Amino acid sequence: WLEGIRKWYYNAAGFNKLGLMRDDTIHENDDVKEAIRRLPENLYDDRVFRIKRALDLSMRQQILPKEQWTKYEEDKSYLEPYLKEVIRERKEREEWAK
Amino acid sequence: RPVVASVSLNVPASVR
């Protein structure tokens, strides 16, 4: 069986212990800088405070208590809609140029 | 004069 592992591996990464999400840990390239730039303020500002505190705890090597940890079911996919939108324009930008 | 606006994708902007 699979689905038990995605929950499991999600616990072994550890970033659910620093109050973070899946999207926050992404590598930044020009394709994503657009997407982040496209995000709304109500959610964008909510990105930073998640990040900003996890850093301060990575400084200390500390974490948050178990209650504040992130749950797998609440690992919202808030960023994927904005993302695949971009690459739908990238691949059109290139193949059309071919 | 009876002024009218005019823009485009490739016609330069204008004012009638």
Partner: protein
């Protein structure tokens, strides 16, 4: 129906000729309106320094006094007829023309004999207009675009007549005579070097009698051309006190009859144009335009392709701030060398399909039609039908362009100009060293 079938369905023009020498032609159409004009061989190319600017001075008195309709009586009869009237001059060609209705057309042709031939040139109006001109040479200081092309033609064609302006220096306008105009009139306005043309709801034979009526009395009986050379030279009217700097650069053009002008009008459109309003912005096709919209380097630029007898001018005009000039040129040359060497076939089809909609949309009415006719009938000889313009283009491919751009862009001796805060404007040497890739 289809495109190619449409071009064959066009009214094919009709040409005539007279004993005096006056070419005449027309084109019937279903338009109830009509227009007529007189495109000729005369401009500042033939005036000397003593009579420079004169042909422009002719423009302002020809409608201000005649032998049979003196004063505003001439101007009156049009407004009574309900028509417009308009005129312009160029460095080679000058044109008077009318927009009117079909039935009142015979009254029109009767005037242009009273205008062209029988101009009166009252000394009062000679002196009044002599102030009007000097009023405008103050105005054209503001017409910064017209400043540049005036400078530009004055450099590449230096020492020749063509470096002259069209309106002329203030000095000659304050020394001009009735007689120099009489001589100027007495030599250039002649049937073998003149054209009549019209379009609309008329017939070519209604017209043929009127020319045989009125202009049959024309004097049907003259130097030829000196080949106006080309120079690669720089000019720069540094002026930091302004907002921006209109800029231009160009090279030798081949001229009218040289067929590769078809190709160059594409390449101008391959690069295209942009001015601070097109919402395409980043999404545009011209890589030049996209960058200009990306970083907001410039505010406007345009290209062109002038045609003169044995030469022309190919180049561009662009307009930006003093902290962006160098990069635009680096990108601009970055496009020319690209087409000299690496021209994608699909990008050619872009411009081939730009130019079709150019000449056609250019031909929307009657007045544009007679611009072409009265111009082609002094340059190309015949008129060229639109089905013929297409067949020439359809021969084109990227193999042609790489030969043409290599012939007229690559490593040549360009001509530069500048009027504004050109503090960043590099030197002609660096510009030429940026002209050849690698």
């Amino acid at each position: 129906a289809t495109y190619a079938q449409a071009l064959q369905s066009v009214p094919e023009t009709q040409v005539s000729q007279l004993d005096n020498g006056l070419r005449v032609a027309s084109e019937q159409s279903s338009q109830p309106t009509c227009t007529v004009g007189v495109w000729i061989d005369a401009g500042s190319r033939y005036e000397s320094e003593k009579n420079n600017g004169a042909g422009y001075f002719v423009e302002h008195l020809a409608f201000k006094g005649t032998k049979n309709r003196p004063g505003n009586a001439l101007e009156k009869e049009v407004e009574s007829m309900g028509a417009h009237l308009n005129a312009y001059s160029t460095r080679e060609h000058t044109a008077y023309y009318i927009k009117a209705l079909s039935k009142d057309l015979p009254k029109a042709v009767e005037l242009l004999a009273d205008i062209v031939q029988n101009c009166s040139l009252e000394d009062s109006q000679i002196e009044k207009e002599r102030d009007v001109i000097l009023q405008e040479l103050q105005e054209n200081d503001t017409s910064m675009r017209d400043v540049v092309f005036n400078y530009l033609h004055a450099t590449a064609f230096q020492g020749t007549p063509l470096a002259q302006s069209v309106e002329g220096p203030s000095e000659n306008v304050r020394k001009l005579s009735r007689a120099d105009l009489t001589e100027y009139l007495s030599r250039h306005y002649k049937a073998p070097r003149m054209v009549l043309a019209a379009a609309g709801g008329l017939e070519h034979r209604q017209l043929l009698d009127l020319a045989q009526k009125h202009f049959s009395g024309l004097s049907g009986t003259v130097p030829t051309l000196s080949p106006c050379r080309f120079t690669g030279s720089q000019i720069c009217h540094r002026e930091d006190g302004l907002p921006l700097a209109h800029v231009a650069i160009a090279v030798e053009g081949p001229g009218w009859a040289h067929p590769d002008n078809v190709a160059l009008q594409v390449a101008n459109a391959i690069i295209g144009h942009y001015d601070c309003t097109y919402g395409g912005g980043a999404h545009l096709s011209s890589p030049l335009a996209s960058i200009a919209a990306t970083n907001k380097l410039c505010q406007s630029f345009q290209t062109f392709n002038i045609c003169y007898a044995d030469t022309g001018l190919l180049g561009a005009h662009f307009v930006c701030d003093h902290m962006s000039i160098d990069d635009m040129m680096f990108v601009l040359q970055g496009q020319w060398m690209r087409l000299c060497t690496s021209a994608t076939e699909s990008e050619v089809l872009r411009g081939k399909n730009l130019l079709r909609n150019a000449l056609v949309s250019h031909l929307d009415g009657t007045t544009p039609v007679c611009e072409d006719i009265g111009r082609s009938l002094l340059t190309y000889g015949r008129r060229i039908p639109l089905a013929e313009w297409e067949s020439r283009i359809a021969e084109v491919d990227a193999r042609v362009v790489r030969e043409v751009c290599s012939k007229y862009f690559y490593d040549q001796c360009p001509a530069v100009a500048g009027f504004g805060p050109i503090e960043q404007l590099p030197d002609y040497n660096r510009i030429r060293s940026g002209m050849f890739w690698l």
